[PDB]
């Protein structure tokens, strides 16, 4: 483990650089020159891209927190800032993935019905409502991110100083991480599964000896795309939520430390954060670059900006 620190710093930096580049590219492609805003999908890709952009811009701060072993030489105010930005971006990202899935289901379900058919009823009333809920589900981070100095060093050691029912939230951090795992993984992934499985069922229902290109290829591509999308989200966000559940469980009853989660939070957790933010680079390629309407924009801008 002599150079595991530097290796993890390097991988954090690589993820950060690649994600920042991809998000800048997708912004510059789809609104700096094209300026597409009519469809609800485009606005949601914009918001998702900027959210994951700042999410992975948050990475280098943790990268230097790891490069200095466990030394965090920064100030309390920007500790609050970094924790708010990371938690809020996590939320906003996941709610915009969920909103994207629901918009796609509604778009492919309300297709023939031209004059027929909190709740996602307005493409404008839910683009900042989602943002506000993401912010408010993260205010606790800033309002309890009280850094402490222990041994000549100060960490972003979040503590909840209060005595409403005890020395912590319910029995530990509790609600603030229960909301993380539940409201950031299970409800959004549940909605994503429901809506994409329903979309594949609907496309299958209408003319699923099947011609290759009209019926067979249609399902073979729609199911492939929804599978890659949901698998990317689940795979990139499962280790981190799994380790936060493990830590919440060892901060609840059934509390064996016994190296059981020590090695986890030593090695797997840096990798878990690496994947959690790698989702923020795989999202723009899946949502703005795969579409040809911006691939052609990239091709035109390659010779417009430079040679």
């Amino acid at each position: 483990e002599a150079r595991v620190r530097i290796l993890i710093s390097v991988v954090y930096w690589v993820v950060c650089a690649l994600g920042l580049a991809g998000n800048l590219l997708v912004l510059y492609l789809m609104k700096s020159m094209q300026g597409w805003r009519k469809s609800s999908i485009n606005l949601f890709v914009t918001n998702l891209a900027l959210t994951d952009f700042q999410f992975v811009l948050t990475l280098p701060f943790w990268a230097v927190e790891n490069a200095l072993d466990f030394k965090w030489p920064f100030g309390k105010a920007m500790c609050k800032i970094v924790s708010m930005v990371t938690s809020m971006n996590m939320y906003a990202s996941v709610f915009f993935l969920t909103a994207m899935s629901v918009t796609r289901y509604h778009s492919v379900a309300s297709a023939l019905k031209s004059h027929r058919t909190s709740c996602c009823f307005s493409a404008k009333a839910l683009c900042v409502w989602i943002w506000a809920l993401a912010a408010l589900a993260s205010l606790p981070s800033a309002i309890f991110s009280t850094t402490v100095k222990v041994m000549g060093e100060e960490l972003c050691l979040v503590r909840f100083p209060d005595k409403l029912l005890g020395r912590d939230r319910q029995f530990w951090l509790g609600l603030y991480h229960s909301q993380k795992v539940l409201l950031g993984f299970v409800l959004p992934l549940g909605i994503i599964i429901l809506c994409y499985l329903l979309l594949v069922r609907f496309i299958a229902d209408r003319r699923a000896g099947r011609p290759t290109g009209a019926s067979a290829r249609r399902l073979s591509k729609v199911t492939k795309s929804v599978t890659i999308v949901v698998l990317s989200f689940f795979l990139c966000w499962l280790p981190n939520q799994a380790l936060t559940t493990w830590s919440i469980l060892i901060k609840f009853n059934a509390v064996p430390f016994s190296q059981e989660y020590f090695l986890c939070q030593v090695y797997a957790f840096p990798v878990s954060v690496c994947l959690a933010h790698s989702n923020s680079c795989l999202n723009p390629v899946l949502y703005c670059l795969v579409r040809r309407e911006f691939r052609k924009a990239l091709k035109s801008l390659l010779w417009r900006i430079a040679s």
Partner: peptide, 24 residues
Amino acid sequence: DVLAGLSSSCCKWGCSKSEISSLC
């Protein structure tokens, strides 16, 4: 500080997980 005393009581006697509640 408090963390040093907690470590002194841990790797000499043991961790009671009581003094580290206010320490984390």
